[PDB]
Design a protein around this ligand. Structure first.
Ligand SMILES: CC(O)(O)NCCCCN
Ligand SMILES: [K+]
Ligand SMILES: [K+]
Ligand code: NA
Ligand SMILES: [Zn+2]
Length: 643
């Protein structure tokens, strides 16, 4: 299974620039590449990636997406003087030409294809291409919006042709619509295109009616084009995560792509003079992380726009940090998306409801200068994952995992804890696991050397109480508990420091807003239901809660449809800088193996196709959203009714 992250870059792509006055294009400068690579070098990220060389796209590769007549016209620009280049540039909208731009365009395109090949041949897990010129606005026969050839459209058509892929997701988080990509795949159900973009009711570039939410694709491609227009500026972390949890991710995991390509424009970040949005560079760590379980981690990130050199460098580093598997930064201050974003989100979900299972319940009444703080460092843990199997069980562990070694001070604390709170306890198994829990938690919370952990335990009540209480005094200001099992746990949810998610078999009405209890009907549809609950309820609440530790718990009677556990374990590491402790009750080799693999950052196997969720499950989940969304605004995917 593949490892490592490709970084594709060449300073030749910085060797073209604007040669005449033009306020429209003067923001697109060679230094965008210079600053981005140097930022990667400064933070040690470039040195940890596999450098893959650029190459030129061939004529045949360019003709996959562009016409012979347009290619022939651009092929003449190396021979043009400045007067001729200015006249050629005026034939198109918001683009300039240069004697070297055709050369660099072929390099930008070939760099993208090198990235696709490295990933699809399993030479790396994922990667990023830092290229100029950008691509997503160029069209079959036109340059547009600083773009000459459509790098990301190349990549999907090339991956289709040479690897016989049937399902490719393109995520365009640039602040501009990628109209070239939309047109290219408009009728194609094999390529799902998602774009959010500043729109402001069509008054923002490129000013197209077809960039609105109503453009869902055409013909057999209906439903495979998703536009989320931002109709106000100033969108925040909360708006972007609301878009992912309530539009993009439900569709992406149902689509089940075989490759993910990201049109990564960081002009959607705070400080950008084109986007004027307010999302922090740290959000891109999470946008990257939330997509990484798709396609077994095969993600090709391709630079598009991004014009504030400071914002650009930091967002590029946050993206590569996540590609490398470094712990995600904690996002504070999350809450409801703004009303304009909620309107865009509800409109997209409604028009897309004829095409996607996660939205289908919506179709029937019965159913329903700027400055910001510098980002903190993101150190990978010395040993990412510590494992404590039952005594004697020897397992083959991934390279960045390690077995537990109870210390002297730790042993004294178990004695103190036993005397005070479990007088009768003398079971020397239980007492060993308590020493393992405290030992693992101490390494997780008081060291950057261990990130997360898994401990197999015997008695849930004592181990849960010790794990929770010990974390709450480290101190962990807030703890998210995720419990797969029935019954009640020694978990008090009164003081706001604990949020409890419970996946259980018995229908039980929960009474307050710090618990989410999910009672999913048994059957062949448990998987789709849980995925729908995870993306649409669990993750929105968990992100807003912003825990300092995640405590996972699985009762023994519930280890037999839990094919979702690896996705949850991977996605929930977006919280608490990845600090997750999982307690598995009883030995199951496969569950322990899956848990350790996901905790350690390994690729997650795809879920493939799934029987769409039970309508009773969707009803249960929407009643949870209604009950919780006034407290946890990140759950909202409609505009609230005003009094
Ligand atoms: C690559 C892009 O999407 O950032 N293009 C920006 C075009 C700006 C036109 N004023
Ligand atoms: K976009
Ligand atoms: K499509
Ligand atoms: Na012009
Ligand atoms: Zn852009």
């Amino acid at each position: 299974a593949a490892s490592g992250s490709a970084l594709i870059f060449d300073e030749e792509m910085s060797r073209y620039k604007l040669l005449w006055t033009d306020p429209e294009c003067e923001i697109e400068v060679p230094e965008r590449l210079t600053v981005s690579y140097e930022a990667l070098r400064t933070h040690g990220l470039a040195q940890r990636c596999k450098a893959v060389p650029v190459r030129q796209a061939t004529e045949q590769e360019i003709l996959l997406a562009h016409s012979e007549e347009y290619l022939e016209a651009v092929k003449q620009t190396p021979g043009m003087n400045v007067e001729e280049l200015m006249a050629f540039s005026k034939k198109y909208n918001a683009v300039y030409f240069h004697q070297n731009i055709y050369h660099c365009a072929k390099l930008a395109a070939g760099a993208t294809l090198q990235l696709v090949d490295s990933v699809m041949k399993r030479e790396v897990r994922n990667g990023m291409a830092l290229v100029r010129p950008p691509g997503h606005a160029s069209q079959r026969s036109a340059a547009n919006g600083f773009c000459v050839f459509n790098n990301v459209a190349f990549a999907a058509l090339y991956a289709k042709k040479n690897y016989n892929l049937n399902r490719i997701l393109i995520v365009d988080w640039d602040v501009h619509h990628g109209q070239g990509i939309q047109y290219c795949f408009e009728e194609d159900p094999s390529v799902l295109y998602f774009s959010w973009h500043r729109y402001e009711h069509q008054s923002f570039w490129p000013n197209l009616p077809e960039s609105d939410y109503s453009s869902v694709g055409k013909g057999k491609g209906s439903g495979f084009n998703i536009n989320l227009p931002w109709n106000k500026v100033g969108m925040t972390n909360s708006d972007y995560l609301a878009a992912f949890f309530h539009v993009l991710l439900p569709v992406a995991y149902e689509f089940d792509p075989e490759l993910v390509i990201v049109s990564a424009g960081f002009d959607s970040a705070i400080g950008d003079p084109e986007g004027e949005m307010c999302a922090l560079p740290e959000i891109f760590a999470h946008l990257t992380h939330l997509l990484m379980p798709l396609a077994a981690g095969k993600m090709c990130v391709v630079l598009e726009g991004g014009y504030n050199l400071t914002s650009l460098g930091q967002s590029v580093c946050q993206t590569v940090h996540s590609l490398l598997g470094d712990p995600t930064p904690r996002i504070s201050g999350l809450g409801t998306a703004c009303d304009s974003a909620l309107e865009s989100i509800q409109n997209v979900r409604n028009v897309q409801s004829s095409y996607w299972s996660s939205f289908k319940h919506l179709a029937q009444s019965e159913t329903n200068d700027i400055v910001w703080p510098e980002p903190l460092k993101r150190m990978p843990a010395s040993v990412r994952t510590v494992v404590v199997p039952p005594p004697g069980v020897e397992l083959t562990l991934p390279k960045n995992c390690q077995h537990s070694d109870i210390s002297e001070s730790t042993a004294k604390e178990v004695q103190r804890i036993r005397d005070k709170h479990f007088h009768d306890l003398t079971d020397q198994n239980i007492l060993r696991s308590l020493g393992n829990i405290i030992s693992v938690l101490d390494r997780m919370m008081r060291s950057d050397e261990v990130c997360n952990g898994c401990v197999v335990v015997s008695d849930l009540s004592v181990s849960v109480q010790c794990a929770l209480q010990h974390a709450l005094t480290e101190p962990a200001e807030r703890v998210l508990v995720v419990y797969v099992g029935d019954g009640e746990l020694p978990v008090k949810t009164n003081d706001g420091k604990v949020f409890l998610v419970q996946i259980c078999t018995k229908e039980t009405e929960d009474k307050c807003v710090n618990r989410l209890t999910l009672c999913l009907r048994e059957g062949e549809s448990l998987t789709a239901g849980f995925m729908q609950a995870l993306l649409g309820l669990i993750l929105p609440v968990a992100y807003e809660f912003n825990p300092a530790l995640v405590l996972g718990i699985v009762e023994e009677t519930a280890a037999k449809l839990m094919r979702v556990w690896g996705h949850m374990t991977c996605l929930i590491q977006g919280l608490a800088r990845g600090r997750m402790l999982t307690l598995l009750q009883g030995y199951d080799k496969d569950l322990l193996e899956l848990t350790v693999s996901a905790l350690s950052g390994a690729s997650i196997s795809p879920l493939g196709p799934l029987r769409a969720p039970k309508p009773e499950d969707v009803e249960m989940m929407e009643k949870q959203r209604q009950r919780l969304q006034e407290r946890w605004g990140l759950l909202r995917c409609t505009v609230s009714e005003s009094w």
